[PDB]
Protein backbone atom coordinates (compact mmCIF):
# COMPACT_ATOMS: atom_id res chain seq x y z
CA UNK A 748 0.00 0.00 0.00
CA UNK A 749 0.90 3.68 0.17
CA UNK A 750 2.59 5.18 3.22
CA UNK A 751 -0.06 6.44 5.55
CA UNK A 752 -0.53 7.66 9.12
CA UNK A 753 -3.08 7.62 11.97
CA UNK A 754 -6.07 5.26 12.04
CA UNK A 755 -5.75 4.67 8.25
CA UNK A 756 -2.22 3.34 8.53
CA UNK A 757 -3.31 1.11 11.42
CA UNK A 758 -6.32 -0.39 9.55
CA UNK A 759 -4.23 -1.05 6.43
CA UNK A 760 -1.59 -2.91 8.47
CA UNK A 761 -4.34 -4.83 10.21
CA UNK A 762 -5.87 -5.71 6.82
CA UNK A 763 -2.58 -7.06 5.39
CA UNK A 764 -2.73 -9.54 8.29
CA UNK A 765 -6.39 -10.54 7.74
CA UNK A 766 -6.70 -14.34 7.87
CA UNK A 767 -8.31 -15.61 4.70
CA UNK A 768 -11.38 -17.84 4.64
CA UNK A 769 -12.31 -21.13 2.88
CA UNK A 770 -15.80 -21.53 1.50
CA UNK A 771 -17.52 -22.39 -1.77
CA UNK A 772 -19.74 -19.67 -3.19
CA UNK A 773 -23.43 -20.57 -3.60
CA UNK A 774 -24.69 -18.21 -6.34
CA UNK A 775 -23.19 -16.66 -9.46
CA UNK A 776 -22.01 -13.04 -9.23
CA UNK A 777 -24.92 -10.55 -9.40
CA UNK A 778 -23.56 -7.31 -10.99
CA UNK A 779 -24.08 -4.21 -8.87
CA UNK A 780 -23.14 -1.75 -11.67
CA UNK A 781 -25.40 -3.50 -14.18
CA UNK A 782 -28.33 -3.34 -11.79
CA UNK A 783 -27.67 0.34 -11.21
CA UNK A 784 -27.94 1.01 -14.97
CA UNK A 785 -31.15 -1.04 -15.13
CA UNK A 786 -32.64 1.04 -12.29
CA UNK A 787 -31.61 4.16 -14.25
CA UNK A 788 -33.48 2.96 -17.40
CA UNK A 789 -36.52 2.14 -15.16
CA UNK A 790 -36.48 5.58 -13.43
CA UNK A 791 -35.97 4.02 -10.00
CA UNK A 792 -33.61 5.90 -7.72
CA UNK A 793 -30.70 3.57 -6.98
CA UNK A 794 -29.62 3.56 -3.34
CA UNK A 795 -26.88 1.40 -1.89
CA UNK A 796 -27.74 0.69 1.73
CA UNK A 797 -24.87 -0.05 4.06
CA UNK A 798 -24.66 -2.37 7.05
CA UNK A 799 -22.04 -0.98 9.38
CA UNK A 800 -22.11 -1.38 13.20
CA UNK A 801 -19.47 1.19 14.01
CA UNK A 802 -17.45 3.92 12.29
CA UNK A 803 -14.32 5.95 13.06
CA UNK A 804 -16.65 8.97 12.89
CA UNK A 805 -18.52 7.74 15.96
CA UNK A 806 -21.45 5.76 14.40
CA UNK A 807 -22.44 3.02 16.90
CA UNK A 808 -25.53 0.96 16.07
CA UNK A 809 -26.37 -2.57 17.16
CA UNK A 810 -29.05 -4.20 15.07
CA UNK A 811 -29.81 -7.49 13.49
CA UNK A 812 -27.99 -7.85 10.17
CA UNK A 813 -30.43 -10.30 8.62
CA UNK A 814 -33.62 -8.40 9.37
CA UNK A 815 -31.83 -5.20 8.17
CA UNK A 816 -30.84 -6.97 4.92
CA UNK A 817 -34.24 -8.61 4.25
CA UNK A 818 -35.90 -5.22 4.73
CA UNK A 819 -33.40 -3.53 2.36
CA UNK A 820 -33.67 -6.28 -0.19
CA UNK A 821 -37.06 -4.79 -1.14
CA UNK A 822 -35.77 -1.26 -1.85
CA UNK A 823 -31.94 -0.97 -2.26
CA UNK A 824 -30.21 -1.43 -5.63
CA UNK A 825 -27.54 -3.21 -3.54
CA UNK A 826 -26.08 -3.74 -0.11
CA UNK A 827 -22.70 -2.68 1.26
CA UNK A 828 -21.65 -4.84 4.18
CA UNK A 829 -18.71 -3.56 6.18
CA UNK A 830 -16.39 -6.42 7.15
CA UNK A 831 -13.61 -4.30 8.76
CA UNK A 832 -13.24 -5.47 12.40
CA UNK A 833 -11.46 -2.97 14.49
CA UNK A 834 -13.07 0.31 13.52
CA UNK A 835 -16.37 -0.96 12.23
CA UNK A 836 -16.99 -4.09 14.31
CA UNK A 837 -17.69 -5.93 11.06
CA UNK A 838 -17.03 -9.57 10.45
CA UNK A 839 -16.85 -12.09 7.60
CA UNK A 840 -19.53 -14.26 9.20
CA UNK A 841 -21.93 -11.29 9.05
CA UNK A 842 -21.26 -11.01 5.33
CA UNK A 843 -21.72 -14.75 4.68
CA UNK A 844 -25.09 -14.81 6.52
CA UNK A 845 -26.39 -11.71 4.70
CA UNK A 846 -25.13 -12.93 1.31
CA UNK A 847 -27.05 -16.24 1.58
CA UNK A 848 -30.22 -14.46 2.82
CA UNK A 849 -30.72 -11.98 -0.10
CA UNK A 850 -30.70 -12.01 -3.87
CA UNK A 851 -29.58 -8.42 -4.58
CA UNK A 852 -25.93 -7.40 -5.37
CA UNK A 853 -23.57 -7.17 -2.40
CA UNK A 854 -20.46 -5.01 -2.00
CA UNK A 855 -17.92 -6.14 0.58
CA UNK A 856 -16.96 -2.88 2.28
CA UNK A 857 -13.47 -3.15 3.67
CA UNK A 858 -9.86 -2.06 3.02
CA UNK A 859 -8.81 -4.34 0.20
CA UNK A 860 -5.02 -4.41 0.16
CA UNK A 861 -4.23 -8.03 -0.82
CA UNK A 862 -5.56 -10.63 -3.22
CA UNK A 863 -6.74 -13.03 -0.49
CA UNK A 864 -9.36 -10.47 0.68
CA UNK A 865 -10.78 -10.64 -2.87
CA UNK A 866 -10.75 -14.39 -2.56
CA UNK A 867 -12.59 -13.85 0.78
CA UNK A 868 -15.26 -11.58 -0.71
CA UNK A 869 -15.81 -14.06 -3.60
CA UNK A 870 -15.95 -17.12 -1.30
CA UNK A 871 -18.32 -15.42 1.16
CA UNK A 872 -20.78 -14.51 -1.58
CA UNK A 873 -20.02 -10.77 -2.16
CA UNK A 874 -20.47 -9.62 -5.77
CA UNK A 875 -17.92 -6.78 -5.67
CA UNK A 876 -15.36 -4.95 -3.55
CA UNK A 877 -14.16 -1.31 -3.36
CA UNK A 878 -10.63 -0.39 -4.30
CA UNK A 879 -9.52 2.86 -2.63
CA UNK A 880 -7.07 5.07 -4.58
CA UNK A 881 -5.87 6.86 -1.46
CA UNK A 882 -4.46 3.71 0.05
CA UNK A 883 -3.17 1.69 -2.89
CA UNK A 884 -0.24 2.41 -5.20
CA UNK A 885 -1.10 2.59 -8.86
CA UNK A 886 0.49 -0.81 -9.47
CA UNK A 887 -1.58 -2.37 -6.68
CA UNK A 888 -4.78 -0.80 -8.00
CA UNK A 889 -4.27 -2.00 -11.51
CA UNK A 890 -3.36 -5.53 -10.36
CA UNK A 891 -6.16 -5.96 -7.78
CA UNK A 892 -8.55 -4.63 -10.33
CA UNK A 893 -7.40 -7.28 -12.88
CA UNK A 894 -7.56 -9.93 -10.11
CA UNK A 895 -11.15 -9.14 -9.08
CA UNK A 896 -12.28 -9.01 -12.74
CA UNK A 897 -10.79 -12.52 -13.27
CA UNK A 898 -13.53 -13.66 -10.84
CA UNK A 899 -16.14 -11.78 -12.89
CA UNK A 900 -16.42 -8.89 -10.40
CA UNK A 901 -16.44 -5.19 -11.34
CA UNK A 902 -14.87 -3.42 -8.36
CA UNK A 903 -15.90 0.13 -7.53
CA UNK A 904 -12.92 2.49 -7.53
CA UNK A 905 -13.19 5.00 -4.67
CA UNK A 906 -11.90 8.50 -5.31
CA UNK A 907 -11.66 11.65 -3.15
CA UNK A 908 -9.92 14.24 -5.44
CA UNK A 909 -8.82 15.05 -9.00
CA UNK A 910 -5.62 13.07 -8.75
CA UNK A 911 -7.62 10.02 -7.58
CA UNK A 912 -9.83 10.52 -10.60
CA UNK A 913 -6.81 10.75 -12.98
CA UNK A 914 -5.46 7.48 -11.57
CA UNK A 915 -8.86 5.74 -11.71
CA UNK A 916 -9.31 6.65 -15.39
CA UNK A 917 -5.66 5.76 -16.20
CA UNK A 918 -6.09 2.26 -14.73
CA UNK A 919 -9.31 1.61 -16.66
CA UNK A 920 -12.01 2.09 -13.91
CA UNK A 921 -15.58 1.72 -15.22
CA UNK A 922 -17.33 1.94 -11.86
CA UNK A 923 -16.40 4.84 -9.56
CA UNK A 924 -17.49 5.87 -6.04
CA UNK A 925 -17.00 9.56 -5.31
CA UNK A 926 -16.48 9.96 -1.55
CA UNK A 927 -17.41 13.22 0.22
CA UNK A 928 -15.42 12.20 3.34
CA UNK A 929 -11.63 12.23 3.41
CA UNK A 930 -10.42 8.73 4.63
CA UNK A 931 -7.60 10.26 6.74
CA UNK A 932 -9.15 13.30 8.44
CA UNK A 933 -12.81 12.30 8.04
CA UNK A 934 -13.62 15.83 6.77
CA UNK A 935 -16.59 16.20 4.46
CA UNK A 936 -16.46 18.44 1.45
CA UNK A 937 -19.53 18.33 -0.75
CA UNK A 938 -18.38 21.14 -3.04
CA UNK A 939 -15.26 19.15 -4.01
CA UNK A 940 -17.44 16.06 -4.45
CA UNK A 941 -19.79 17.83 -6.95
CA UNK A 942 -16.73 19.24 -8.68
CA UNK A 943 -15.18 15.76 -9.08
CA UNK A 944 -18.49 14.36 -10.38
CA UNK A 945 -18.62 16.87 -13.29
CA UNK A 946 -15.13 15.63 -14.35
CA UNK A 947 -16.07 12.00 -14.82
CA UNK A 948 -16.86 10.61 -18.32
CA UNK A 949 -20.54 9.86 -18.96
CA UNK A 950 -19.92 6.17 -19.62
CA UNK A 951 -18.55 5.53 -16.09
CA UNK A 952 -21.13 4.25 -13.57
CA UNK A 953 -20.97 6.85 -10.76
CA UNK A 954 -21.92 6.35 -7.14
CA UNK A 955 -21.91 9.34 -4.83
CA UNK A 956 -21.51 8.94 -1.04
CA UNK A 957 -24.52 10.76 0.44
CA UNK A 958 -25.63 11.32 4.04
CA UNK A 959 -26.47 14.62 5.71
CA UNK A 960 -29.38 16.11 3.80
CA UNK A 961 -30.36 13.30 1.31
CA UNK A 962 -33.45 13.73 -0.94
CA UNK A 963 -32.20 17.24 -1.89
CA UNK A 964 -28.77 15.87 -2.52
CA UNK A 965 -30.17 12.90 -4.52
CA UNK A 966 -32.21 15.14 -6.91
CA UNK A 967 -29.34 17.59 -7.50
CA UNK A 968 -26.56 15.01 -7.96
CA UNK A 969 -28.73 12.85 -10.17
CA UNK A 970 -28.95 15.85 -12.57
CA UNK A 971 -25.15 16.03 -12.53
CA UNK A 972 -25.06 12.48 -13.97
CA UNK A 973 -24.72 10.45 -10.78
CA UNK A 974 -26.14 6.94 -11.24
CA UNK A 975 -26.53 5.69 -7.64
CA UNK A 976 -26.12 6.83 -4.00
CA UNK A 977 -24.43 5.08 -1.07
CA UNK A 978 -25.73 5.87 2.36
CA UNK A 979 -24.63 4.63 5.77
CA UNK A 980 -25.63 6.32 9.08
CA UNK A 981 -29.12 7.56 8.38
CA UNK A 982 -30.19 4.08 7.20
CA UNK A 983 -28.48 2.18 10.02
CA UNK A 984 -30.36 4.56 12.33
CA UNK A 985 -33.72 4.50 10.51
CA UNK A 986 -33.92 1.80 7.84
CA UNK A 987 -37.45 2.79 6.67
CA UNK A 988 -36.05 6.11 5.50
CA UNK A 989 -34.93 4.47 2.29
CA UNK A 990 -38.60 4.28 1.14
CA UNK A 991 -39.17 8.00 1.22
CA UNK A 992 -35.81 8.62 -0.43
CA UNK A 993 -36.82 6.37 -3.36
CA UNK A 994 -40.52 7.46 -3.53
CA UNK A 995 -42.25 10.37 -1.71
Ligand SMILES: *C(C)CC(=O)c1ccc2cc(OC)ccc2c1
Nearest residue numbers: 827831835856857858877924977
Ligand atom coordinates in the same frame (compact mmCIF):
# COMPACT_ATOMS: atom_id res chain seq x y z
C1 LIG B 1 -18.07 3.12 -1.98
C2 LIG B 1 -19.57 2.84 -2.02
C3 LIG B 1 -17.17 2.17 -1.22
C4 LIG B 1 -17.95 1.72 -0.02
O1 LIG B 1 -19.12 1.38 -0.14
C5 LIG B 1 -17.34 1.70 1.35
C6 LIG B 1 -18.10 2.30 2.34
C7 LIG B 1 -17.64 2.33 3.64
C8 LIG B 1 -16.42 1.76 3.94
C9 LIG B 1 -15.99 1.82 5.24
C10 LIG B 1 -14.79 1.26 5.61
O2 LIG B 1 -14.41 1.36 6.92
C11 LIG B 1 -14.21 0.20 7.73
C12 LIG B 1 -14.00 0.65 4.64
C13 LIG B 1 -14.42 0.59 3.31
C14 LIG B 1 -15.64 1.15 2.95
C15 LIG B 1 -16.11 1.12 1.64
